[PDB]
Amino acid sequence: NKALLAKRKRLEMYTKASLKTSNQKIEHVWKTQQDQRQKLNQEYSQQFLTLFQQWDLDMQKAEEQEEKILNMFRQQQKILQQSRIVQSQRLKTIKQLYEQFIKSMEELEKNHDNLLTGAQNEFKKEMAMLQKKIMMETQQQEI
Amino acid sequence: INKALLAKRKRLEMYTKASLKTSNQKIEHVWKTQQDQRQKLNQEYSQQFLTLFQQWDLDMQKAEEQEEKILNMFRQQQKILQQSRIVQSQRLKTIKQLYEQFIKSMEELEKNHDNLLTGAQNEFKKEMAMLQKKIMMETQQQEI
Amino acid sequence: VQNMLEGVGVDINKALLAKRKRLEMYTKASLKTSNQKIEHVWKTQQDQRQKLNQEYSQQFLTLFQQWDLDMQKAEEQEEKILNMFRQQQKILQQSRIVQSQRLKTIKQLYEQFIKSMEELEKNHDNLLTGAQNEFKKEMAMLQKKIMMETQQ
Amino acid sequence: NKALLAKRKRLEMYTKASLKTSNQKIEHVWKTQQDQRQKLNQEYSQQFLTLFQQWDLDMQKAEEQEEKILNMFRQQQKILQQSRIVQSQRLKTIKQLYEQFIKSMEELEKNHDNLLTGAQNEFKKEMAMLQKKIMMETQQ
């Protein structure tokens, strides 16, 4: 009976050990599956993170280049506006110079008119004197 | 005799006066003609220059209007370029957030599943232990 | 008497075989059931992971479809910007050609004006010469008349 | 009659000289006035020539600057275009990576199904051996 109980205890210990091992092997299958699902998620998350980081950097570069264009345009828009302003001033200058030219010609005409009248009056006196000389030197004297 | 001589003299003097008056008037008409032609020429060109200046002023008014349209067009194009960048950044944020939500939902599901699996595994262990205990008790030699 | 104990032994071995067969049948059935229950937990978990994937895939598909449509609209906007610019670029280059012509026109009219004044001066020189010569013929005729008539 | 002809010739010579002198003095007034009109034209022509030259140069620079703005616009139309192309590629890349991810998870599910089946079958063999051992040893 001591032998009987020793045999029973031996079989019970072996059963306990066998169940423990068989269950642990199944537990390792769950852990493997879980490891592989997490590994797959980590691999794709790294790839998505790389894409999102590259996209964010490209948007930062695009913002930087917009700033460069705005500055370039600001400068060129000022030069273009000034070149139009100068042309409008040029038109005003030519119109004013033309009016000045016409006015100078009118002032000169008035001066010339008065000088010509004086010269014409002298010419008339000279011609009258010439005819008076001819008349007096040819005319028959009174008897 | 002297009355006749003086009448002849008076006649010649009147003719001389009339001739000088006419000859001088003809020269005076040359001055007036020259003056007329110079003024006519100035008036003709002034009218032409005025037409050109008026047309030029209107064309400068149109050129300023069109210059404003093309600069506005560039500024409007910049608005489109800037907006498309802003929308892209929003899109990136939306996709990034949806991806993080997906990963988080999978992690939450894993935690729920872990607890459910532990419970099921414990029941399985009890059933296997019960099965082996049944085999042992039904086969074993009884105490004497 | 020994034959009896031996005959008892056969009935013992028959009983032993029957007991073993019964336990083997029960074990087979129990392992099958216990494994099936675990398999169902696995299938449930797998169903819920697939359901989650299907739900997110639908949401990602919506985002990608909306993005594709927005790129089609952006291509439409880009085409209108070009077309409005092409029209405006033509009007602007035409304006600049006209103002170039205006400078040429004014420069030519100015040169024509100066040349006309020079030509008029030359014509006026001939009108004065002609008038002075006519005056010189009239004075000679007048003197001839006075001379001839004062001798009479 | 010799005296009469001498007198006439003297008066004719004087008249010719007087008309010549009087006309020359008027001609000089005319030439002076003409000189002053010609001088005035030359002064203004110099000023107009300067303005026209400067205007021509300013129109050359205005043409070049307009060209720069039109060029700047054309360069941005290319950037807005290359923005649309890069976006479409980016969308394609993300969409493909997402589909790959979903497909990989489906493939993993199928592999995991086989790992569980295999483990369950090994477990069944282990329990059968264990029962056989208990049975054989409880009789001996």
Curated annotation (Swiss-Prot), chain A:
Keywords: Cell cycle, Cell division, Centromere, Chromosome, Coiled coil, DNA-binding, Meiosis, Nucleus, Phosphoprotein. One of its GO terms (biological process) is sperm DNA condensation. A motif (Nuclear localization signal) lies at residues 7-10. Residues 1-142 form a coiled coil. Testis-specific. It is found in: Nucleus; Chromosome; Chromosome, Centromere. One of its GO terms (cellular component) is synaptonemal complex. Residues 7-10 are annotated as: Interaction with DNA. Phosphorylated. Component of the lateral elements of synaptonemal complexes. Homotetramer; the tetrameric helix bundles assemble end to end into long homopolimeric fibers that exhibit a transversal striation with a periodicity of about 20 nm (in vitro). Interacts with SYCP2. Forms a complex with EWSR1, PRDM9, REC8 and SYCP1; complex formation is dependent of phosphorylated form of REC8 and requires PRDM9 bound to hotspot DNA; EWSR1 joins PRDM9 with the chromosomal axis through REC8. Composed of a long central coiled coil domain. The N-terminal and C-terminal regions interact with DNA. It is linked to Spermatogenic failure 4: An infertility disorder characterized by azoospermia, a condition of having no sperm present in the ejaculate. Testicular histology shows arrest of spermatogenesis at the pachytene stage of primary spermatocytes. Pregnancy loss, recurrent, 4: A common complication of pregnancy, resulting in spontaneous abortion before the fetus has reached viability. The term includes all miscarriages from the time of conception until 24 weeks of gestation. Recurrent pregnancy loss is defined as 3 or more consecutive spontaneous abortions. Component of the synaptonemal complexes (SCS), formed between homologous chromosomes during meiotic prophase. Required for centromere pairing during meiosis in male germ cells. Required for normal meiosis during spermatogenesis and male fertility. Plays a lesser role in female fertility. Required for efficient phosphorylation of HORMAD1 and HORMAD2. Belongs to the XLR/SYCP3 family. This is Synaptonemal complex protein 3. It comes from Homo sapiens. The gene is SYCP3. The chain holds residues 82 to 224 of 236 of the full protein.
